[PDB]
């Protein structure tokens, strides 16, 4: 929460380069990204008989039933 407070104060003070964000001081969830990557390379390497991934939220392509979205990679 103090990271949120830091960000509110630095944005209010006109210091966006001092915030915690992707365009600033980065806090990348690298372990969750690595696990998402491993789930993306699962179907064929560590899950050989599995055709597609367990969920496209881990990584893949966007299912576009009708004009609407159903699931995409949640970055």
């Amino acid at each position: 929460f103090g990271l949120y407070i830091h960000n509110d104060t630095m944005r209010a003070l006109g210091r966006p380069q001092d915030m915690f964000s992707d365009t600033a001081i980065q806090l990348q969830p690298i372990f969750a990204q690595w696990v998402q990557h491993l789930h993306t390379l699962a179907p064929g390497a560590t899950a050989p008989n599995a055709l597609a991934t367990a969920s496209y939220a881990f990584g893949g392509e966007t299912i576009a039933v009708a004009g609407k979205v159903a699931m995409m990679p949640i970055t």
Binding site: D8, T9, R11, A12, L13, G14, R15, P16
Partner: protein
């Protein structure tokens, strides 16, 4: 430990509570160790000297920051399109965006825009230069020096005075009503006719040319010889430009009942006429009580002389009741100050008297909200100190069968009837509001229940305003009060019938519904405060409450449970209802003034009758510029108000912690934290001097209430200032 010096019971306390209670009981002078009444009064007198010096240093600082870092003369040139500057910002935390955003109002440095009305007040009193502000700031510095030395000297031996002059009520009240009230009013009327009107009609009246200038062509002599109507020869015309000689009159005491067309403030000459008349009445009322010669009244005799058939002792021994109780005196003073602060708020928005303050919408909103908040605080304090009087100072034998003990006698009737009328008001206001909301939501807003405020519109009609067709009293052209000459009447009719002022605004059923909501809030806050004051001494659940004092946590879970049974707790409960009522009134005032100032009164007239209109068209709509004070695309000058808005939300919710969670959970949690510190290597070298404990039950309620109130105030102040300065300022 030593601290607190004044409480050995708290000084022996080995916990952190000591420090907290040493903070909270420092100004409860009576409960200090070894306190007599004499030293109590002398210490209070010195603290009053210190407080007066603090107020004067606050004013000197206001003057110094207007003079040093403000734009006062630039605002003098154009006081309708230049924002006043409070002081300069020196914050090393600012980025380039905030530096550019707060470099506003023509400044070359980051500044804050003043909203206290300060520039309009020093324009209306004839100050035009920063050098005068600096000279006055140095003058208030040396005046505060004199008051601080006076306090120190009157704490010395051979200058510490007795107990007799403190209880000398007649001489002190004559002195305050004459020398402090009437003489000061006379001196301010002298300042008005000597500076304010001759600076409105452009001229320089400084201290150098103070000796030789007549305010009027015919001088003091027609004041002495006879009729003063010479001072009503020619008022300022309706083409007058403030601060110049164009359209200028020479008369210094007239009346036409209304506003000067340019500044849209009260006529300065009319203000002077009022002030001289009020000073004369204050001089007259100041010769009403006895002195060292023996012609005036003694207040005890008048109090003892008033009785009645069905009232018992009447007003017997209330002189010694009020004169020996500082809490009764405080209650009366706080109640009077709160009522007149509410009067100040309700008059200055509707009858402004400062030059061009009526076009400064955010300033007017800030002033009205500030004074109504101060009034709510003072009224709650009045009822709280009346409860403290009943706990500590009330003598049931000396006050037997008078009005005080009779109010004690039928206290159940008062509390039950207040409860009934609060239930009445709340039931029917909520029923009408919810009915309106439901039938508006069902696509059919014509089955709403809408009552015209007919009595309030008739009160509007019987003052000059003719927009309703009642045609009675001053609206009626042929009525007796209308045909009296009385040259305030046509100007007053023009001021109350032109719809460009806040003077007697037109009202619909939304005004009526929110007035009954305001009535409910006033009645319920009074019910809580009155029940607390009248059960401070005892109730059927706790008849020895006066032995436990004003403030104590409870009487335990026994006898069914007794949480929040003290009168302090009723003060604490009534704080919430006072804030609720003040929020309701400020919401109504701000939404009406946003409708009036922008010209779109139809939004209030068709949406205030149901609560979704209040939710959407007032709260949701007017936050949009506030919450965009900072965003991912940048900042503007409302960045500080967005941050303070969020800060107030946080402080309010932090108060919810102490209000909802209670002590014993926290005491057990702190016990585990104490264990953790006592077993951690390299931190066992560090020991606390006071044992960490949880906050007390009363401390928990007080701390949660303080956060609740601070968050309430800061949130609404941020919203009010940001919405009005984004829409208009």
């Amino acid at each position: 430990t030593k601290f607190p010096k004044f409480s050995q019971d708290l000084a022996q306390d080995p916990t952190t509570r000591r420090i907290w209670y040493g903070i909270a009981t420092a100004h409860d002078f009576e409960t200090h160790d070894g306190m007599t009444e004499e030293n109590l009064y002398q210490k209070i007198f010195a603290s009053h000297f210190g407080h007066i010096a603090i107020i004067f240093l606050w004013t000197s600082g206001t003057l110094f920051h207007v003079a040093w870092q403000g734009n006062f003369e630039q605002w003098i040139k154009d006081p309708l399109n230049i924002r006043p500057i409070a002081h300069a910002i020196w914050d090393p935390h600012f980025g380039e965006g905030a530096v550019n955003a707060f470099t506003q109002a023509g400044a070359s440095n980051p500044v804050n825009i003043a909203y206290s009305g300060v520039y309009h007040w020093f324009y209306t009193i004839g100050m035009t230069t920063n050098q005068e502000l600096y000279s006055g700031a140095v003058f208030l510095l040396v005046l505060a020096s004199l008051f601080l030395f006076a306090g120190w000297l009157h704490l010395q031996p051979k200058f510490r005075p007795s107990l007799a002059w403190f209880k000398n009520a007649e001489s002190r009240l004559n002195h305050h009503l004459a020398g402090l009230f009437g003489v000061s009013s006379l001196a301010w009327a002298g300042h008005l006719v000597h500076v304010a009107i001759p600076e409105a009609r452009g001229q320089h009246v400084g201290w150098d040319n103070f000796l030789s200038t007549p305010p009027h062509p015919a001088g003091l002599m027609p004041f002495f010889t006879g009729n003063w109507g010479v001072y009503a020869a020619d008022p300022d015309t309706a083409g007058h430009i403030f601060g110049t000689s164009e359209g200028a009159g020479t008369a210094i005491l007239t009346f036409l009942g209304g506003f000067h067309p340019q500044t849209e403030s009260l006529w300065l000459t009319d203000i002077a006429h009022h002030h001289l008349a009020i000073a004369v009445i204050f001089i007259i009322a100041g010769h009403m009580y006895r002195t060292n010669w023996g012609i005036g009244h003694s207040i005890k005799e008048i109090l003892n002389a008033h009785k009645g058939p069905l009232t018992g002792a009447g007003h017997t021994n209330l002189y010694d009741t009020i004169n020996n109780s500082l809490h009764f005196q405080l209650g009366l003073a706080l109640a009077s100050l709160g009522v007149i602060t509410s009067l100040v708020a309700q008059h200055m928005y509707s009858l402004p008297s400062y030059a061009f303050i009526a076009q400064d919408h955010t300033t007017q909103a800030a002033l009205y909200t500030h004074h109504q908040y101060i009034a709510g605080f003072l009224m709650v304090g009045a009822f709280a100190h009346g409860a403290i009087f009943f706990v500590r100072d009330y003598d049931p034998v000396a006050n037997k069968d008078n009005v005080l003990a009779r109010m004690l006698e039928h206290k159940e009737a008062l509390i039950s009837h207040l409860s009934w009328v609060s239930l009445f008001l709340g039931f029917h206001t909520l029923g009408l509001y919810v009915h309106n909301d439901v039938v508006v939501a069902f696509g059919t807003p014509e089955k709403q229940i809408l009552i015209e405020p007919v009595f309030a519109q008739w009160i509007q009609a019987t003052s000059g305003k003719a927009l309703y067709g009642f045609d009675v009293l001053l609206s009626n052209p042929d009525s007796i009060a209308s045909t009296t000459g009385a040259a305030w009447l046509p100007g007053w009719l023009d001021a109350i019938n032109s719809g460009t002022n806040s003077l007697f605004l037109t009202i619909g059923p939304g005004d009526f519904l929110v007035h009954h909501a305001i009535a409910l809030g006033l009645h319920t806050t009074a019910l809580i405060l009155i029940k607390g004051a009248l059960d401070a001494r005892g109730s059927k659940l706790m008849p020895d409450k006066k032995d436990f004092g004003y403030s104590f946590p409870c009487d335990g879970p026994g006898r069914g449970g007794t949480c929040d049974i003290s009168a302090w707790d009723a003060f604490y409960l009534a704080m919430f209802w006072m804030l609720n009522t003040l929020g309701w009134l400020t919401f109504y005032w701000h939404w009406k003034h946003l409708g009036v100032w922008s010209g779109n009164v139809a939004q209030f007239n068709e949406n205030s009758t149901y609560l979704m209109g209040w939710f959407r068209d007032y709260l949701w709509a007017n936050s949009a510029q506030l919450i965009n004070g900072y965003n991912p695309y940048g900042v503007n000058n409302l960045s500080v108000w967005a941050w303070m808005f969020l800060f107030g939300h946080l402080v309010w919710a932090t108060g919810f912690m102490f209000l909802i969670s209670w002590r014993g959970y926290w005491q057990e949690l702190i016990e585990t934290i104490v264990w953790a510190h006592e077993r951690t290597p390299l931190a066992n070298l560090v020991r606390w001097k006071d044992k960490p404990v949880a906050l007390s039950i009363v401390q928990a309620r007080l701390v949660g209430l303080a956060h609740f109130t601070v968050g309430y105030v800061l949130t609404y102040a941020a919203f009010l200032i940001a919405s009005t300065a984004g829409k208009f300022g």
